[PDB]
Amino acid sequence: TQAVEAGEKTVEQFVQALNKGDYNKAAEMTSKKAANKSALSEKEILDKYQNIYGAADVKGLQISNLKVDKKDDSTYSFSYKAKMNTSLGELKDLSYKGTLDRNDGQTTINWQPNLVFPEMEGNDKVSLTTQEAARGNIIDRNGEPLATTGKLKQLGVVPSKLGDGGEKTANIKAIASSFDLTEDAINQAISQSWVQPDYFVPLKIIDGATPELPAGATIQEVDGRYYPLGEAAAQLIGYVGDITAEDIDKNPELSSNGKIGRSGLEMAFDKDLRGTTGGKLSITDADGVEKKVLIEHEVQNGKDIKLTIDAKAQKTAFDSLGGKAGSTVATTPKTGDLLALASSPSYDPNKMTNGISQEDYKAYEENPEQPFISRFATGYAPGSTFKMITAAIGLDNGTIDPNEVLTINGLKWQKDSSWGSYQVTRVSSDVSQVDLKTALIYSDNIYTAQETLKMGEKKFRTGLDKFIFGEDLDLPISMNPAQISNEDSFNSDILLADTGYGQGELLINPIQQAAMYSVFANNGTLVYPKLIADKETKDKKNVIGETAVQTIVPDLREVVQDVNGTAHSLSALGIPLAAKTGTAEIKEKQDVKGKENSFLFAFNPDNQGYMMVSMLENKEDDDSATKRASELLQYLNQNYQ
Numbered sequence: 224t225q226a227v228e229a230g231e232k233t234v235e236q237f238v239q240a241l242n243k244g245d246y247n248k249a250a251e252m253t254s255k256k257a258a259n260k261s262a263l264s265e266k267e268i269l270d271k272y273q274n275i276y277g278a279a280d281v282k283g284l285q286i287s288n289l290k291v292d293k294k295d296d297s298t299y300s301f302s303y304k305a306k307m308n309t310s311l312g313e314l315k316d317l318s319y320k321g322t323l324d325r326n327d328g329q330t331t332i333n334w335q336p337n338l339v340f341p342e343m344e345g346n347d348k349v350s351l352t353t354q355e356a357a358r359g360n361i362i363d364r365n366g367e368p369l370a371t372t373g374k375l376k377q378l379g380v381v382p383s384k385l386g387d388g389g390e391k392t393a394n395i396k397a398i399a400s401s402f403d404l405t406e407d408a409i410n411q412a413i414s415q416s417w418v419q420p421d422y423f424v425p426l427k428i429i430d431g432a433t434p435e436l437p438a439g440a441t442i443q444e445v446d447g448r449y450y451p452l453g454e455a456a457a458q459l460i461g462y463v464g465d466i467t468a469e470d471i472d473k474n475p476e477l478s479s480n481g482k483i484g485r486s487g488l489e490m491a492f493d494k495d496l497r498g499t500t501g502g503k504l505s506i507t508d509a510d511g512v513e514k515k516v517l518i519e520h521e522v523q524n525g526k527d528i529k530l531t532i533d534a535k536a537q538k539t540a541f542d543s544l545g546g547k548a549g550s551t552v553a554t555t556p557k558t559g560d561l562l563a564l565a566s567s568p569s570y571d572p573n574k575m576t577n578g579i580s581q582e583d584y585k586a587y588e589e590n591p592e593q594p595f596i597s598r599f600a601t602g603y604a605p606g607s608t609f610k611m612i613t614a615a616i617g618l619d620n621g622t623i624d625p626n627e628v629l630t631i632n633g634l635k636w637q638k639d640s641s642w643g644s645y646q647v648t649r650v651s652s653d654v655s656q657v658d659l660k661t662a663l664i665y666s667d668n669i670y671t672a673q674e675t676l677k678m679g680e681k682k683f684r685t686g687l688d689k690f691i692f693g694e695d696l697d698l699p700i701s702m703n704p705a706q707i708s709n710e711d712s713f714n715s716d717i718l719l720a721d722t723g724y725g726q727g728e729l730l731i732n733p734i735q736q737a738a739m740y741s742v743f744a745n746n747g748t749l750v751y752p753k754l755i756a757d758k759e760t761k762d763k764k765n766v767i768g769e770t771a772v773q774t775i776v777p778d779l780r781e782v783v784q785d786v787n788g789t790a791h792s793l794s795a796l797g798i799p800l801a802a803k804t805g806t807a808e809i810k811e812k813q814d815v816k817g818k819e820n821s822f823l824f825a826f827n828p829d830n831q832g833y834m835m836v837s838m839l840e841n842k843e844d845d846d847s848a849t850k851r852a853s854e855l856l857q858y859l860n861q862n863y864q
């Protein structure tokens with residue numbers, strides 16, 4: 224009994240060495256090489272595990288049901304059940320057994336081939352055959368391809384079929400001008416350390432039709448991942464990359480030759496899209512005869528993922544941003560279907576997945592507008608669009624009378640002298656008797672600031688807490704929950720008023736804004752957005768009152784229709800529009816000149832068929848989201864009713 228506890232310890236640390244992959248440490252816990260003892264030397268055991276466990280990518284050996292007995296003055300037997308993870312999934316219910324040795328004072332293991340796999344004897348071999356799974360597709364709400372696997376045209380040259388000096392330089396210049404490639408990059412491609420004179424050195428993937436091929440230029444079809452919308456949906460869809468050895472160490476069920484999603488939905492739905500590897504892991508005898516099949520199953524190709532995205536709305540939304548920094552979210556607000564999730568500027572995901580230059584990748588990483596940012600999932604201060612919610616809250620708690628007129632003189636206002644030099648500011652002093660309708664049409668900050676301070680912080684937060692602040696949206700998109708402020712209290716009349724008209728410490732991303740603003744298309748019911756097509760519609764009742772929606776939406780119509788409405792340029796469409804604009808000012812202590820973000824909210828107040836939230840980040844002068852929304856509004860109004 225005093226020594227049986229030492230034997231259980233030995234089996235435990237032997238398994239732990241195999242589990243951690245230290246096959247050398249496990250080999251040094253074996254007996255001397257002899258009959259009825261260890262079957263191989265320590266260095267031979269190290270190679271046995273490294274070859275076999277490495278061939279099947281064995282990872283995580285954990286055991287159970289350990290039993291250690293005594294059969295002799297120095298021969299203690301043991302047995303346990305074990306399970307492990309391999310390239311073909313989990314291998315469970317493994318019955319291991321053996322013996323130990325109690326010579327001197329320490330305890331060692333009489334190693335045998337049955338401690339690699341249970342059924343192995345002597346010089347048995349292990350064989351692994353595998354079949355790659357085809358990656359599933361990502362498709363829009365109408366089955367159009369967003370991410371698919373197809374045949375690509377691979378352009379490349381063979382250095383020997385170019386020339387010997389003047390004939391080679393003439394062809395390199397002819398190939399550079401015929402396929403739009405840097406002539407200095409073609410000479411750097413055939414000069415890499417892996418290139419032989421007769422090899423096919425790939426250059427670029429031509430996406431159109433094959434032009435005339437000069438001397439030495441060839442075209443070779445190759446299968447690869449393809450994104451039809453290109454940069455227009457790069458942030459949302461993402462890209463796949465070559466699987467590394469480090470990836471396999473974390474998940475052995477990946478394909479060493481396959482692709483793995485690196486960002487976006489390709490990474491979010493990698494498990495569903497990549498499928499499962501098929502094949503057979505078997506033990507053979509010394510003659511090659513199949514002795515036992517440990518694992519075997521057929522290849523399961525990846526499942527397709529169908530999104531709510533409209534591929535034509537996505538491309539229209541992205542192109543409307545003109546390469547400027549910004550984002551656009553389009554929904555069907557009654558159900559929550561996300562029609563478009565555009566972010567700009569963007570990167571080329573096809574170039575990204577077909578091998579990209581280190582120079583081209585750094586141009587993306589050092590672009591000040593940062594194309595890699597998923598701006599539709601980035602929190603921003605919403606701007607004056609948030610007045611719709613402050614007003615709705617004020618109507619529900621009886622603070623705001625829609626017809627009551629406030630006297631506001633000039634362009635500046637402060638509660639009292641304790642605000643110092645700070646003042647709320649409005650753009651026009653032409654209306655001194657301001658009601659809710661006028662405040663929404665003109666976007667009067669002073670009206671909103673006074674109504675917010677009038678209702679107070681308690682009532683304001685009571686209405687705010689009924690929305691989705693702090694909630695994690697059920698979306699396959701990485702994002703942080705929206706916030707009202709940094710802490711649970713404003714502890715500032717100035718901060719309270721600023722929050723009223725959408726400034727302050729508010730942080731809401733465009734998707735969360737589309738969710739909060741859905742109340743005005745559902746009589747005060749919030750409808751959570753939805754990206755996966757088959758998902759069920761989830762909502763939130765009684766966020767704001769139905770009375771508030773009936774009061775505010777007719778005013779939002781006048782934001783478009785009134786001759787002085789901030790969105791009056793949208794009247795040219797001639798379609799039923801309810802809108803609200805906004806311009807947020809950002810001045811952190813790192814930039815001298817301040818930045819401005821433009822915002823636009825718009826939906827159909829007749830049929831509630833669509834709803835959009837567009838924004839421009841660090842906008843240029845004489846630029847806005849409203850300037851750019853006509854084309855997407857025409858499409859959404861025509862196709863979503």
Ligand SMILES: *C(=O)[C@@H](NC(=O)Cc1ccccc1)[C@@H]1N[C@@H](C(=O)O)C(C)(C)S1
Nearest residue numbers: 606607650666668789804805806807808
């Ligand atoms: C809400 O966003 C409001 N914006 C400001 O008070 C800041 C600002 C920024 C630039 C110029 C002037 C004032 C109001 N709403 C916006 C808008 O709807 O675009 C206005 C510029 C009308 S002020």
